[PDB]
Ligand binder design. Structure first.
Ligand SMILES: NCCCC[C@H](N)C(=O)NOP(=O)(O)OC[C@H]1O[C@@H](n2cnc3c(N)ncnc32)[C@H](O)[C@@H]1O
Ligand SMILES: NCCCC[C@H](N)C(=O)NOP(=O)(O)OC[C@H]1O[C@@H](n2cnc3c(N)ncnc32)[C@H](O)[C@@H]1O
Ligand SMILES: [Mg+2]
Ligand SMILES: [Mg+2]
Lengths: 484, 484
């Protein structure tokens, strides 16, 4: 249907060339961007602009073009929006007017001219110089949820709002580092290719190094090397880097995502809760100018202090079941069968409690909530709670029914840590193939002495979704993993 | 080595618990860093301190200890330095003093006490409260790049100069993003898992996605996806991220390294030259306080503007062979034989010229130098020079004999880009297993139109090696890839 349409364009290219101009342009000096023009000359009168001859120079893509004859208009779009340009043969000459006439929607051009207003009052640029910058061999679509991610470049051109989202994303990450850097946290870079994939319960992407003939695993967490830094005496460190998990895609999951991992010597999980809430309220204030944001049909208030609720209590409140009493694994399995909570063959009281939470409770936590007291069985890298060792001084931040962060009072006792790992291995022989793996090197590190520490993990992408009211993670990732 | 010392520390742990103490501590609130205490109170005499009775709280690892019966001293080290603590049973009580007595070198403790100077004059802290915070089961290093790289934590604790290097690295990167952002370049995040390993000439790490059953390649460059963003109308983008290349290690290369990639629509490689020198000059100025630096035996002057030299003129200056001469591939092969320049079967004029440069010229370029005009055969993503099509508008930045950047006037003409890819595939046929691979998606992207663009790539690790006078990249990477 539109196969020679591409040939129509492939022809104007030949014509443009033989017309003596580089169809793919040279450098172009600009003076402003569309948005600056309106903010600087949007309120000036038509005749005072005509008098002032304010010369500008801009560049962009042709989104709309109209008017035949010896004069025409077109809307040029740059990163900040669109601005109308007006080209008259009796102004730019014949060669340039010809360049304007052959120009296609989608083609990129640069112009020099003066500000002025049409009778209808639109602010525009009276072109006195029309430069051809780039020929588009394929036309613009016209003005598909999944076709937007498959060709993000087309999306960014056609939907202004998407652009805003990604800009907002850059501001969020930038705001995060300014806060952390100013509070003494050292931004560092640790390995992404590991001998042993530790720091979480997750399946890894496996690769191989040819020269060193080594099997390397892409990191499923940043935790283990950062901890080595704490043993290293660095005290405060953070890292915002990519993490990789051989998992299937979700509305809130992507194989490679961005996580913030930070550790603070001499702090515990309650300290981290405060850090977490201040950090996020800060970012919201700095970037959006407020702590009250919309997400779905919810108005989420990020103003500290946020609710602290123990996982076991959350379960009593939303389910009506108690896990505070001493309980046998058998009794936990009964309560599970009764409430329709699924359990794995390797699960025990601890795992079951968490299943009760994740399956019957979490989705209902809308306002920022610090869920704490995660059972020790599912927290192999966290310190046991003193008063009741069945649970740990760990917490997960929940907002709009999903986890935005994971943190704990770190386990620096190396003997206990080794014991957690063996238990993890036992769980594996029992069906759990996400059980953590023994890392002697890491354990060796703890053996030189890691001070008491508080660690924090934050899903940056998810935070971005929250602050941009994005229903899917693929709306906040420039090139989400495609099924292909 | 410490067969029993281990038994002794191990058994010591048990004794701390009997004292009723958590051998791995709780959180501890500090008031200052050791260094701040010297900067604030070092000038005050012994009695001035006695009058002002300055209460403080510090924490650190025990570096030295002296036990004089019922009172002793110890030097504890925090991230900023050491401070001496004076612990007398008369003040802290018998219980706490037994904790002090049993404390081993390497153990971490925190104290609260007042500032004061001993008869000798060393600023100290007369402790009123001694808190055991962590037991080191192994004794710190007794003293080879081995443990420094394999056990970086020990290095960071025992060698302050290594610690500063990593602190300076955080500053260099922080400084870089400062310039870029304030100059309008948008920081973004693009995929590290690619369907096609393109954007560079390198052998990648291959991996597999289970759920989607798909072969993925770890990025060998960030280029392609960033250019899709320029097509997207983002105009000015940058990404400081990890890049992976399945190549052997050396003092100049690590399999996973940090590269800065940035693109600017409407600019060309000359514009990029100016940016590169301003950026680097900015970082050095802001971090070292000067652009005049020392690297090894060299006194390198980073003050712009830097020397501009065409690769061909460089070969003429440093070797004597003039490649401006139109010659056949065979004559170039003959010239290669006569000057001891090794070539490969797939090579023609263009490749040979570059080998003359890398083999015979590179190492002689000490002062910052912009080498430009790379032959087209090795520049598949760079636009060809208008005057002499054998070369492209591209440059590499050489300093102290090594490459620190690669950049060019981007090839935005899709017909020509396709042609280059075909040439590369052809080379791979002839044995060049580092030839760029085809990426239809990228070609489709350029087909929608990409403005003339200026692209740049800087090896961040190498820039930091330069600014910290680190002879090896393994000195600016917290945990470098080690040999099996
Ligand atoms: N030492 C304290 C804990 C630090 C973090 C820990 N090392 C870790 O690996 N945690 O993993 P998670 O708790 O599963 O991840 C933390 C956050 O990252 C986000 N996240 C996790 N997995 C994905 C994913 N696959 N895709 C996108 N986002 C993800 C989410 O917000 C989650 O709460
Ligand atoms: N579009 C303009 C060019 C952008 C960069 C281009 N896409 C690219 O891939 N370049 O690759 P190189 O030029 O080989 O690398 C750029 C810089 O990275 C550094 N580098 C390259 N490989 C390693 C390495 N293996 N280890 C440490 N640093 C490295 C070095 O400074 C080098 O000059
Ligand atoms: Mg979580
Ligand atoms: Mg290079």
């Amino acid at each position: 249907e539109l196969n020679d349409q591409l040939r129509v364009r492939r022809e104007k290219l030949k014509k443009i060339e033989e017309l003596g101009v580089d169809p793919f342009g040279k450098r172009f000096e600009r003076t402003h961007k569309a948005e600056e023009l309106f903010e600087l000359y949007g309120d000036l009168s038509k005749e005072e602009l005509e008098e002032q001859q304010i010369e500008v120079a801009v560049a962009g893509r042709i989104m709309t073009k109209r008017g035949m004859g010896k004069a025409g208009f077109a809307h040029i779009q740059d990163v900040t929006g669109q601005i109308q340009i007006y080209v008259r043969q009796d102004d730019v000459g014949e060669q340039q007017y010809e360049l304007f006439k052959i120009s296609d929607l989608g083609d990129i051009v640069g112009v020099r001219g003066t500000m002025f207003k049409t009778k209808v009052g639109e602010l525009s640029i009276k072109v006195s110089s029309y430069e051809f910058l780039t020929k588009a061999l394929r036309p613009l679509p016209e003005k598909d949820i999944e076709q937007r991610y498959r060709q993000r470049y087309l999306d960014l051109i056609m939907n202004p709002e998407s652009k805003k989202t990604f800009i907002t994303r850059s501001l969020i990450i930038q705001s995060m580092r300014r806060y952390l850097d100013s509070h003494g946290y050292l931004e560092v870079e640790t390995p992404m290719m590991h001998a042993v994939a530790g720091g979480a319960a997750a399946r890894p992407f496996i690769t191989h190094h040819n020269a060193l003939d080594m099997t390397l695993y892409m990191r499923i967490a940043i935790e283990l090397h950062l901890k080595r830094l704490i043993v290293g005496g660095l005290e405060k460190v953070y890292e915002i880097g990519r993490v990789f998990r051989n998992e299937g895609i979700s509305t809130r999951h992507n194989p490679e995502f961005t996580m913030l991992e930070l550790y603070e010597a001499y702090a515990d999980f309650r300290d981290i809760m405060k850090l977490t809430e201040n950090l996020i309220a800060h970012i919201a204030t700095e970037v959006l100018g407020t702590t009250k944001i919309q997400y779905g049909e919810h108005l989420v208030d990020l103003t500290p202090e946020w609710r602290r609720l123990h996982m076991v209590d959350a379960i009593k409140e939303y389910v009506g079941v108690d896990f505070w009493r001493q309980m046998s694994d058998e009794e936990a399995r009964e309560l599970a069968k009764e409430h329709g909570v699924e359990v794995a063959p390797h699960m025990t009281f601890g795992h079951i409690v968490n299943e009760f939470f994740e399956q019957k409770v979490e989705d209902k936590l809308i306002q920022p909530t610090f869920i704490y007291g995660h059972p020790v069985e599912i927290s192999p890298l966290a310190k046991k709670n003193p008063d009741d060792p069945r649970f740990t001084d760990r917490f997960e931040l929940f907002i709009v029914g999903r986890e935005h962060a994971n943190a704990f009072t770190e386990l620096n006792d190396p003997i206990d840590q080794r014991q957690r790992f063996e238990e993890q291995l036992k769980e594996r022989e029992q069906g759990n193939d996400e059980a953590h793996e023994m890392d002697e090197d890491f354990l060796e590190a703890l053996e030189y002495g890691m001070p008491p520490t508080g660690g924090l993990g934050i899903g940056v992408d998810r935070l971005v979704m929250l602050l941009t009211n994005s229903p899917s993670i693929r709306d906040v990732l420039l090139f989400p993993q495609m099924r292909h």
